[PDB]
């Protein structure tokens, strides 16, 4: 259940420097005050990320998704290949009290929005769901710079996340914050494209502050530093400079 609209929203897909964001713990090992070199999929330093203010974007290897959000306007994500009834698809939402993850192969429509009523009761993202397998529920994920890394390897979907109190106006901060493993999921899909879910007030849709940043991962070698407590404090990209 969804309808089209005349006010065809479009986003100012500007570009921004990546700086040194998008670092996550690669495994579960503990190391104290040591420098460790690892080869894996990362977000290269000082690259260009695409800034938006809803397209279907390629997944490629993995994605890095950031939002300088206030009041948590964004809701969820949808992953898959064809996003129809024919092929298996993945959905993730977070309404108000818990994250809901489904691997249900339902089909969507042109406009995948949630909508709220002003005691909220509104959900018409998709229409029909015939076959499906997996389900999962957990605690909610979400001024607030939220960073997420989505990866999918070897039939396993991995999600890393981090939250930061941001004070700068619009650009990404020039700081360092490693991303911690949030969750792992044992599902075999061939995700290649995805989208983004939006929440708008309905009573008059008001969805204009859709400001976020998207970037892509590539394989490379990094050098990480672990302090005494075993947390990552600094990293060095390797194929960036002769000095590196």
């Amino acid at each position: 259940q969804c309808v089209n609209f005349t006010n065809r929203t479009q986003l100012p897909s500007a570009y921004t420097n990546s700086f040194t964001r998008g670092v996550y713990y690669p495994d579960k090992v503990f190391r104290s005050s040591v420098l460790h070199s690892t080869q894996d999929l990362f977000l290269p330093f000082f690259s260009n990320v695409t800034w938006f203010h809803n397209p279907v974007l390629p997944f490629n290897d993995g994605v890095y998704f950031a939002s300088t959000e206030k009041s948590n306007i964004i809701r969820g994500w949808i992953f898959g290949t064809t996003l129809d009834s024919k092929t298996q698809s993945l959905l993730i939402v977070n309404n108000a009290t818990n994250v809901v993850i489904k691997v249900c192969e339902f089909q969507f429509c042109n406009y995948p929005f949630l909508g709220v009523y002003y005691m909220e009761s509104e959900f018409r993202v998709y229409s029909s769901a015939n076959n499906c397998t997996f389900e999962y529920v957990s605690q909610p994920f979400l001024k607030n710079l939220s960073e997420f890394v989505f990866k999918n390897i070897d039939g396993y979907f991995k999600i890393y996340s981090k939250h930061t109190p941001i004070n700068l106006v619009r650009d990404l901060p020039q700081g360092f914050s490693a991303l911690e493993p949030l969750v792992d999921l044992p599902i075999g899909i061939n995700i290649t494209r995805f989208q983004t879910l939006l929440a708008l007030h309905r009573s008059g849709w008001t969805a204009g502050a859709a400001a976020y940043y998207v970037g892509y991962l590539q394989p490379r070698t990094f050098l990480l530093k672990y302090n005494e407590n075993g947390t990552i404090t600094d990293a060095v990209d390797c194929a960036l400079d002769p000095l590196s």
């Binding site: 579960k28 104290s32 396993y156 911690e180 493993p181 407590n229 947390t231």
Partner: protein, 366 residues
């Protein structure tokens, strides 16, 4: 030992290394997370009513731990014919999905549910492939299904034009035509009904008595396997060289208490050259510490076989706490070089005769 290693019947004054020494592991321990998320076998084997064979009820089992031992050892099963694998080893290997097919049949027809079998039920209502891997359970259910007036709720496709491929459910209600006389969905010259009911009664003889049947089929598709049997864990000991299997990470050593502090998501630690040094037990979530149990060479101090015949023994770099006939022997002394038995310490000082190490050496006087 010195004579054998040196390959001579006479040995001169000196110190020689003969062999090694190492503490042997005492016993083995295994640790694993708490057993939880048991597969809901209860709602199948204890369902109020079952489905008929021609519409056999299929359920999917995934993302849980399944314990077949409680079913296997259970003596309430009149028939447990389990073909795909050995049931005893069933708790070990595991798959990515399970299918439970439940229904009710007659006593004699039970033998038809097997690979390479034919018959009414084996061909017209539910078919098993010749290569079927799985495990079939059947038990008498006279006290439930049988009714004094005769239960007729269970039906089976008595008549059908064509046979059934493995795992092929068909609920078609076509009026079967025996001959060439057409029927517009009605009975007549050669037109009958494919489905016929059972007449279960309490006084029906055995074999004509209702038996409830569940077939478990194992699916091993390339997706990650989520259904596996429970892992048995044991108690944990400390301060003893043992071999351990912490959540699949195996190795030998002695386990002590550690004051390290992991972040809430690490599991184990290593320092340099990737050697594990600390583990977090899945059940208590407290950081332990691993240390290799002691080892080192042994050496024999002799004054020359021509002079005397008694010797002393040095265990190199071994604390004089776990030495073990030469377990006590003579006065035992502890040095930076190791532990020394068969010799006695003095507070004099002479020129070095047989260098032992760390600034001390021995001579014959005893």
């Amino acid at each position: 030992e010195t004579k054998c290693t040196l390959k001579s019947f006479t040995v001169e004054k000196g110190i020689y290394q003969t062999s090694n020494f190492r503490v042997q592991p005492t016993e083995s321990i295994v640790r694993f997370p708490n057993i939880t998320n048991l597969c809901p076998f209860g709602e199948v084997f204890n369902a109020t009513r079952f489905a008929s064979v021609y519409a056999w009820n299929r359920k999917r089992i995934s993302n849980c731990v399944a314990d077949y031992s409680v079913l296997y050892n259970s003596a309430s099963f009149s028939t447990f014919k389990c073909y795909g694998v050995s049931p005893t080893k069933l708790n070990d290997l595991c798959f990515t999905n399970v299918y439970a097919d439940s229904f009710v049949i007659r006593g004699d027809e039970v033998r038809q549910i097997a690979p390479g079998q034919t018959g009414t039920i084996a061909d017209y209502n539910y078919k098993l492939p010749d290569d079927f891997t799985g495990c079939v359970i059947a038990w008498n259910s006279n006290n439930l299904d049988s009714k004094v007036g005769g239960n007729y709720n269970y039906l089976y496709r008595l008549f059908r034009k064509s046979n059934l491929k493995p795992f092929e459910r068909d609920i078609s209600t076509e009026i079967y035509q025996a001959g060439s006389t057409p029927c517009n969905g009605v009975k007549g010259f050669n037109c009958y009904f494919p489905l016929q009911s059972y007449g279960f009664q309490p006084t029906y003889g055995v074999g004509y008595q209702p038996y409830r049947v569940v077939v478990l089929s194992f699916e091993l598709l390339h997706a990650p396997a989520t259904v596996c049997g429970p892992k048995k864990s044991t108690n944990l000991v400390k301060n003893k060289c043992v071999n351990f299997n912490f959540n699949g990470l195996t190795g030998t050593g002695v386990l002590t208490e550690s004051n390290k502090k992991f972040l809430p998501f690490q599991q184990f630690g290593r320092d340099i050259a990737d050697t594990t040094d600390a583990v977090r037990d899945p059940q208590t979530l407290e950081i332990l510490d691993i240390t290799p149990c002691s080892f080192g060479g042994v050496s024999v101090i002799t004054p020359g076989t021509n002079t005397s015949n008694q010797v002393a023994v040095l265990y190199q770099g071994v604390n004089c706490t776990e030495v073990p006939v030469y377990s006590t022997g003579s006065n035992v002394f502890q040095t930076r070089a190791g532990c020394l038995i068969g010799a006695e310490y003095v507070n004099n000082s002479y020129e070095c005769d047989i260098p032992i190490g760390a600034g001390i050496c021995a001579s014959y006087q005893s």
